[PDB]
Every structure is written in structure tokens, then in C-alpha cells.
Design a protein around this motif. Structure first.
Motif, PDB file in Angstrom:
ATOM      1  N   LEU A  56       0.823  -1.208   0.000  1.00 23.56           N
ATOM      2  CA  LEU A  56       0.000   0.000   0.000  1.00 23.56           C
ATOM      3  C   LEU A  56       0.857   1.257   0.000  1.00 23.56           C
ATOM      4  O   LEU A  56       0.451   2.288  -0.555  1.00 23.56           O
ATOM      5  N   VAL A  57       2.035   1.191   0.617  1.00 23.43           N
ATOM      6  CA  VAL A  57       2.956   2.318   0.594  1.00 23.43           C
ATOM      7  C   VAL A  57       3.547   2.488  -0.804  1.00 23.43           C
ATOM      8  O   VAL A  57       3.603   3.601  -1.351  1.00 23.43           O
ATOM      9  N   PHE A  58       3.975   1.386  -1.417  1.00 21.11           N
ATOM     10  CA  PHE A  58       4.588   1.480  -2.742  1.00 21.11           C
ATOM     11  C   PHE A  58       3.585   1.969  -3.788  1.00 21.11           C
ATOM     12  O   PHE A  58       3.923   2.796  -4.645  1.00 21.11           O
ATOM     13  N   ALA A  60       0.981   3.896  -3.318  1.00 21.11           N
ATOM     14  CA  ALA A  60       0.799   5.337  -3.150  1.00 21.11           C
ATOM     15  C   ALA A  60       1.857   6.114  -3.923  1.00 21.11           C
ATOM     16  O   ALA A  60       1.558   7.137  -4.550  1.00 21.11           O
ATOM     17  N   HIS A  61       3.103   5.647  -3.873  1.00 20.19           N
ATOM     18  CA  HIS A  61       4.191   6.289  -4.605  1.00 20.19           C
ATOM     19  C   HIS A  61       3.966   6.203  -6.117  1.00 20.19           C
ATOM     20  O   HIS A  61       4.043   7.214  -6.836  1.00 20.19           O
ATOM     21  N   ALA A  63       1.142   5.614  -7.648  1.00 22.15           N
ATOM     22  CA  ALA A  63      -0.073   6.351  -7.996  1.00 22.15           C
ATOM     23  C   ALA A  63       0.230   7.800  -8.374  1.00 22.15           C
ATOM     24  O   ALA A  63      -0.386   8.348  -9.298  1.00 22.15           O
ATOM     25  N   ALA A  64       1.188   8.429  -7.686  1.00 21.41           N
ATOM     26  CA  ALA A  64       1.527   9.816  -7.976  1.00 21.41           C
ATOM     27  C   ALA A  64       2.280   9.967  -9.287  1.00 21.41           C
ATOM     28  O   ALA A  64       2.400  11.089  -9.788  1.00 21.41           O
ATOM     29  N   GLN A  65       2.791   8.874  -9.840  1.00 25.56           N
ATOM     30  CA  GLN A  65       3.557   8.882 -11.072  1.00 25.56           C
ATOM     31  C   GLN A  65       2.741   8.447 -12.279  1.00 25.56           C
ATOM     32  O   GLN A  65       3.257   8.463 -13.403  1.00 25.56           O
ATOM     33  N   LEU A  95      -8.378   6.784  -2.348  1.00 21.24           N
ATOM     34  CA  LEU A  95      -8.571   8.211  -2.567  1.00 21.24           C
ATOM     35  C   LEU A  95      -7.366   8.825  -3.269  1.00 21.24           C
ATOM     36  O   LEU A  95      -7.529   9.564  -4.249  1.00 21.24           O
ATOM     37  N   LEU A  96      -6.144   8.490  -2.823  1.00 21.91           N
ATOM     38  CA  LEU A  96      -4.950   9.061  -3.452  1.00 21.91           C
ATOM     39  C   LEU A  96      -4.774   8.611  -4.896  1.00 21.91           C
ATOM     40  O   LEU A  96      -4.171   9.338  -5.699  1.00 21.91           O
ATOM     41  N   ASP A  98      -7.412   8.121  -6.806  1.00 22.75           N
ATOM     42  CA  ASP A  98      -8.610   8.589  -7.505  1.00 22.75           C
ATOM     43  C   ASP A  98      -9.440   7.412  -8.026  1.00 22.75           C
ATOM     44  O   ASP A  98      -9.943   7.432  -9.148  1.00 22.75           O
TER      45      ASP A  98
ATOM     46  N   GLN B  17     -10.755  13.014   0.366  1.00 23.16           N
ATOM     47  CA  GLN B  17      -9.955  13.063  -0.849  1.00 23.16           C
ATOM     48  C   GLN B  17      -9.529  14.497  -1.152  1.00 23.16           C
ATOM     49  O   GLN B  17      -8.404  14.736  -1.612  1.00 23.16           O
ATOM     50  N   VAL B  57       1.528   5.934   4.135  1.00 20.90           N
ATOM     51  CA  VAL B  57       0.960   5.848   2.792  1.00 20.90           C
ATOM     52  C   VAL B  57       0.919   7.228   2.144  1.00 20.90           C
ATOM     53  O   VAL B  57       1.313   7.408   0.980  1.00 20.90           O
ATOM     54  N   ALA B  60       4.377   8.493   1.141  1.00 18.84           N
ATOM     55  CA  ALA B  60       4.889   7.880  -0.084  1.00 18.84           C
ATOM     56  C   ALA B  60       4.372   8.609  -1.311  1.00 18.84           C
ATOM     57  O   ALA B  60       5.092   8.743  -2.307  1.00 18.84           O
ATOM     58  N   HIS B  61       3.141   9.117  -1.239  1.00 21.09           N
ATOM     59  CA  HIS B  61       2.513   9.762  -2.385  1.00 21.09           C
ATOM     60  C   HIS B  61       3.079  11.171  -2.581  1.00 21.09           C
ATOM     61  O   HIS B  61       3.469  11.545  -3.693  1.00 21.09           O
ATOM     62  N   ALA B  64       6.712  11.346  -4.036  1.00 21.18           N
ATOM     63  CA  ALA B  64       6.851  11.284  -5.485  1.00 21.18           C
ATOM     64  C   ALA B  64       6.622  12.635  -6.153  1.00 21.18           C
ATOM     65  O   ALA B  64       7.024  12.817  -7.310  1.00 21.18           O
ATOM     66  N   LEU B  96      11.911   4.902  -0.737  1.00 27.10           N
ATOM     67  CA  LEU B  96      11.129   5.631  -1.730  1.00 27.10           C
ATOM     68  C   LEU B  96      11.391   7.130  -1.669  1.00 27.10           C
ATOM     69  O   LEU B  96      11.363   7.806  -2.703  1.00 27.10           O
TER      70      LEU B  96
END
Lengths: 325, 327
Positions: A56-58, A60-61, A63-65, A95-96, A98, B17, B57, B60-61, B64, B96
Motif C-alpha cells: 500500500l505504501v509502494f 501510493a508512490h 499512484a503519484a507517477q 482516494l490518493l 482517484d 480526498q 501511505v 509515499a505519495h 513522489a 522511496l
């Protein structure tokens, strides 16, 4: 109309930080060439089993890319979790992203890996069921041990995106009865060591479909090993070492395999390896893929370079996908 | 040479959100105007207390989306965790972020929030110490209940970036003894019968005990978190703050703590809110003697419930006008 997926256990050669950066690039490239979905597997304590204990952490990362590709766990080893924290992390993650998250759960794993989490492997089935119930209750918005406690952020949409990995007819009935998705493994032990994989997995699909409630669309992920290269000889060259390693583990695990040849390994370990023409032909022999709603492809078996993985992704999207979408 | 931090509990008006979008954008803006660090707080089950139960979580977002700014938890409520899974998630996250992670831990929390995690508020301190010990062992590479279990990915670098939030001299001694960083809160209750005592009279003895307890060769790490909301117009900033500050006063009273008076001035002094235009916020911060001793100073609007765009401007004004006084 089937969805095409990229699957990784994050096993590329290098330190964990390098593995995470190469996996992220591989997922971004899959999205760029038109894959619908990416799936990542969770593994604890064992660099050679998988490089990621925190899906879930990876995600999220990543997802932003990314922007379009769906992002899923295949799987979270739910008996090895505090289930309420999983519920929260997934609620936040979706949510992060979308709304791109897919939550796949499984119970299995190396017996010694259960011990740090307060259970044994013989308890995995019962603990899985309890944890799944808690998560479902939290996402539904039930009170959580006190009337002032409800999950925040809310996640009523997530119950509909649960998938269950199983190897058995009984596991498939439990998943179907619940309306959950079915996740089929890249390979399974045979009852008859040469039986085709679709002979094994079609009874699983049959039981799943017969157990779904009226009104629930089936969701069936068929995950397969594929490594595609421009030169057929190169693809077989790359795969030979990883396949011999996979054969040794299968025998030490109590499962026999007839032969020592690459061709014998490709059939018995369910590895689709070659140039596009040869991989299309072997895939066409697997009747599961026609029944699945989602097909995913992983190199594992094989240990290609990062660039050879990028090319395999491209070749699958260009030449394989038109036959199986 | 002090580090300047942006702190958020993720409480902007909106759905979760939207709160996450707004917090991500606030963190990116803080990096853009030259903040050194960002800190986010973990809160469960209560939209009004904080919007984020999953700081690892969310970090991490935003990692990036960012490049230079350090990213920290202030805090992870460790008693409400499976500690091995925290150890794993943080070890993955630090990689990360390319080594930008700061890991702050705290014990306290809303009492009813402990119950879903199999403990009560009264058990929080003992569970904290057990969980912290397990995490420390995991990151060190010790075996995990069996000789073939070692944490993957390794995180030998993370023990040196642990921070402990505490209100008490005793917690500060325990943090200093271990060499951890000290995390000081934006406000804290006053001694009995001294409701007007300034916050630095409370927290300076905490710093003293922390520093006396550090082993030789461990650089002190002291985060002073403060409430600040800065706007171009002094009256606009006071106008925005008054409803939030009134809610904070009442909450402080319901918990049994003393608040003398009902004016905004009484609230600003006794709730430790630095609110105004830059000249007035600089002048009020300059009165807090902790800030000269801290190695890290962080600013949160909370108390105040400003708009997102007013938060962006507050971040800009702090970077432009407050920072040169306190870096």
C-alpha cells in the motif's frame, strides 16, 4: 472485453531501493503502452521471494507517477496484518489513486513468516476469514469497538473491489458466494505431472461462477508467466537459469516434474517464453484466458534485465494483447 | 542553524480526498518557498481531530511529488499499530523518499480510539515501550521470532531518525537517554494555579532534562511545533482565527483545564496561537525562548481553520518574513 495487466514481485537484481525504482518505471511503461492494470505482490523477510513487504505504501508512490493504469495488490497476506490498519491504509490509498485501487487478499506464505505476526501457518485460514470480516465491517462504516468510532476516511466503494487468491474449488466457492474476485495463480501443483494448467483451473472457475449471487459480475484474474523478446533464442537463453531454479524448488517442495529440458520446464512450470509468435501460440492453448475478465503477465520464473523487461512489456502490449483482449 | 517545518493534521474543509489533495499541495508549496521539512499527524476515526490514519501511505505519495523537503510523522501513535508492519512500511518509505524520512512516535491519543486496537489508554505507555523496542530491533537487523526472519528491506539508517513526542520531563529523559529527538507540542496544559504561565516556562525544563540525558556524541534534535497563521492584513488573520480559537478554548475547558478570560487576547496567550500579520507574529514568536534552543521549528495553522489559499499565503509569509529571524 478483457483487461491486460502487468504483475511484479519486485525481484529485479539490486538493492531494495533499486528494485523499487525499477518496478515503478516498469509500471509507468506498462501504462504508457496501454496496459489496463498493474499488480504487486507482498512478501516478508525474503529478498529472493519478493522485494516488497508494504504494497500500500509502494502503490501510493506509483499512484503519484501514473494517471490511468489501475493499481492492485496480488496479494496482501491478510493473516499477517493488523486488519483495521489495512482497512485504513487501503481507504486512504484509493482516494490518493482517484479510484484506481484493487484489493487482492491471500492467506498463504512461508510457514516461518507467520511466527513474527503471532500465528502459525495452520491458523491462516481461520485468521484470514476473521480479518476479512473486520475489514468489510470497517469499510461498510460499522462502529469499531465503540459507538464514537467509525472508519475515517470512509470507504463504502472498496468492498466491491475485493479479490481472493485461491488454489482450490472450495476457496473459489467462498469467494464467489461473497461476490469477490477470483485470482488464479501463474502455476499450481498437479494431481499426472503433465496435466495442462487449464485442466487444473477451469474446475476452479466453474465453482466460482456457480457460487456468485445474481447480479454480481464475475471478476476472474488469470495471472501467467510470460517473457517475450524480439529473438526467440534470446528469450530461451534468458529463462534457462531461472527455470532450473524454479524446477529445483518445485522438487524440494514435494512435487515431481518429468524431465530436465527447457521445453519440459516451460510446459510443467507454465512459463510462456519466446518471441511474440511463439508466446501467442502457447497462450492460445490455455482455455482459461478466454474465460478470465483480467489477464496479467509476470516475468517470474525468469530473471531478465530491467531493459529486457521493458521490451517484454512492449511486445506483449503490441503483439500479444490483440489476441486476448 | 535551524530547520523550518510545515506541520499539518489534514483538517481543511472538504471530503477526505479533497483534504489529501490540499495537504499535498500545501507541502509542495512549502518546499517551493524554501521550507526544510514537512510533518503530518496520524489520527483515527475523527474527521474533526485529523484527516489521516495512514501517514506512511500519504508520505509515499507526496514524496513522489517533491524532491528536497524532508518528510516526517508527528506522530505515529505507536500503541495503535502492529509494530513490525510499521517497521516494514517505514523501511520501504525511506527508500522511496531517498532518505528524507523522519520517524516521530507518540503514545497518547483520544481514549476511545485505543479500544479497536485491543488496548486501553491506561496501557498506552507500556505498549509504546514494547512496540518501540520491537521496531528498533527490526531495523537493526535482529531475528524476528525465528532465525530465518530478518527485516527486508534493511533499515540500519532509521534508528538515528527516531523522534519522541512528550509533554513531561520524564519522557524527555527517556528520549535523551536513547538518543532520540525531542518533539515539543504547540500547546500543553499549565501547572495547577498558573494558567497564564508562558509556554517556554513549561517546555524549557523539558529541554534541560533532554539535553542532560543525551549520551556523548549524539547531536541534540529538538522540534518545537507552534501554532502560527500569518496574513497580509493583521485584522484579517484575527478575524479568521476567532471561531477556531473559541472551539479550542471550550475543548480545553471540557478536558478540565483552566482558561482565564474569554477575549481573543486571552485565547492567543493561553492557547499559544501566533496569529496576525508578519510584524506581529515575529514579535510574539520572539517572546518564546524555546525557539532559540530548538534545532527544528514547525508551524501549523491548527487552532485556526483558514481557507486553503490563506494557508498557502501563510506558508509564503512565514518563509519570506518569519524565517530570517529564526533560522
Amino acid at each position: 472485453p478483457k483487461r491486460l495487466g502487468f504483475f511484479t514481485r519486485l525481484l529485479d537484481q539490486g538493492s531494495a531501493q533499486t528494485r523499487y525504482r525499477l518496478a515503478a518505471e516498469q509500471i509507468r511503461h506498462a501504462e504508457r503502452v496501454g496496459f489496463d492494470s498493474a499488480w504487486i505482490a507482498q512478501h516478508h523477510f525474503h529478498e529472493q521471494e519478493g522485494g516488497l513487504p508494504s504494497p500500500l505504501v509502494f502503490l501510493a508512490h506509483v499512484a503519484a507517477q501514473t494517471d490511468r493504469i489501475r493499481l492492485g495488490t496480488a496479494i496482501i497476506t491478510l493473516p499477517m496484518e493488523n486488519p483495521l490498519r489495512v482497512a485504513e491504509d487501503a481507504a486512504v490509498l484509493d482516494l490518493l489513486t482517484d479510484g484506481r485501487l484493487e484489493v487482492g487478499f491471500g492467506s498463504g506464505g512461508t510457514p516461518t513468516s507467520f511466527l513474527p505476526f503471532g500465528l502459525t501457518s495452520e491458523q491462516r485460514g481461520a485468521v484470514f476469514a476473521d480479518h476479512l470480516h473486520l475489514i468489510h465491517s470497517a469499510w461498510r462504516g460499522d462502529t469499531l469497538s465503540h459507538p464514537d468510532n467509525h472508519l475515517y476516511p470512509p470507504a463504502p466503494q472498496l468492498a466491491a473491489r475485493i479479490w481472493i487468491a485461491t488454489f482450490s474449488v472450495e476457496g473459489a466457492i467462498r469467494a464467489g458466494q461473497a461476490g469477490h474476485g477470483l485470482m488464479l495463480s501463474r502455476t499450481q501443483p498437479r494431481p499426472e505431472p503433465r496435466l495442462p494448467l487449464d485442466a487444473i483451473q477451469n474446475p476452479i472457475i466453474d465453482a466460482y461462477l456457480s457460487a456468485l449471487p445474481d447480479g454480481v459480475a464475475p471478476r476472474i484474474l488469470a495471472s501467467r508467466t510470460a517473457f517475450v523478446a524480439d529473438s526467440h533464442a534470446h528469450a530461451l537463453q534468458v529463462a534457462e537459469p531461472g527455470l532450473r531454479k524454479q524446477a529445483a524448488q518445485h522438487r524440494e517442495a514435494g512435487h515431481r516434474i518429468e524431465g530436465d529440458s527447457v521445453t519440459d520446464y516451460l510446459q510443467q512450470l507454465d512459463a510462456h517464453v519466446g518471441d511474440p509468435e511463439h508466446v501467442i501460440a502457447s497462450l492460445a492453448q490455455d482455455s482459461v484466458l478466454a474465460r478470465a475478465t483480467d489477464i496479467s503477465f509476470q516475468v517470474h520464473s525468469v530473471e531478465p534485465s530491467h531493459r529486457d523487461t521493458l521490451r517484454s512489456i512492449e511486445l506483449i502490449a503490441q503483439h500479444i494483447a490483440p489476441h486476448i483482449r
